[PDB]
């Protein structure tokens, strides 16, 4: 998915290179959905970048090729896959999850999101009297966008 035009947008200085720390968002900008961990491993698996402060389109392009397989996998999953995996947080299969549990898994597990990012995701999301949300609709409404 390597794309020069997107690289250009990121290279706001036209210096022909973007901050190494901006690698993850560039990969996301071009279409992949890598975890922050994968982005770090990609950068770390290349000894040459050890003291690199920035990355050129050529270097980035090489990293995409070497890790093409894993990066591509981050795009395969469909909405139904997340819904299926979310069942671990709903054993009663009630199809519902408390906003409390949802905020916890989003801000307390994995690559934690901030409370502010979660507050934003919950904007408009319907919460019933029991204080639960339909996670299938939630997941759908977050991705289908």
């Amino acid at each position: 998915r390597a794309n020069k035009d997107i690289f250009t947008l990121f290279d706001k200085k036209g210096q022909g290179a973007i901050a190494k720390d901006s690698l993850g968002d560039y990969l996301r900008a071009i279409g992949y959905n890598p975890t922050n961990q994968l982005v770090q491993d990609i950068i770390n698996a290349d000894s040459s970048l050890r003291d690199a402060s920035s990355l050129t389109l050529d270097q980035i392009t090489g990293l995409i090729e070497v890790n093409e397989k894993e990066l591509d996998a981050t795009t395969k999953a469909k909405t139904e896959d997340f819904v299926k995996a979310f069942q671990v947080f709903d054993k009663e299969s009630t199809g519902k999850v408390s906003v409390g549990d949802l905020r916890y898994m989003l801000t307390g597990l994995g690559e934690k999101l901030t409370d502010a990012e979660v507050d934003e995701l919950l904007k408009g999301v319907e919460v019933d009297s029991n204080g639960e949300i339909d996670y299938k609709k939630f997941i759908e409404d977050v991705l289908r966008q």
Binding site: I6, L9, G24, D25, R28, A29, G31, Y32, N33, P34, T35, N36, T74, A77, F82, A85, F86, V88, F89, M105, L106, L109, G110, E111, K112, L113, E117, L121, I139, V142, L143, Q145
Partner: protein
């Protein structure tokens, strides 16, 4: 006269621990895949 019961309990405890461990890993994995999808979607929405 209690060694048998203790051993049985310990066997059930080992099963309990693994299942708890697996359940927690599945929760972490679920959170992680969902967070990654959110970040990808979010970055793109903001770039374009």
């Amino acid at each position: 006269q209690i060694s048998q019961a203790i051993k049985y309990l310990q066997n059930n405890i080992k099963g309990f621990i693994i299942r708890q461990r697996v359940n927690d890993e599945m929760k972490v994995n679920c959170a992680t895949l969902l967070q990654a999808a959110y970040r990808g979607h979010s970055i793109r929405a903001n770039v374009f």
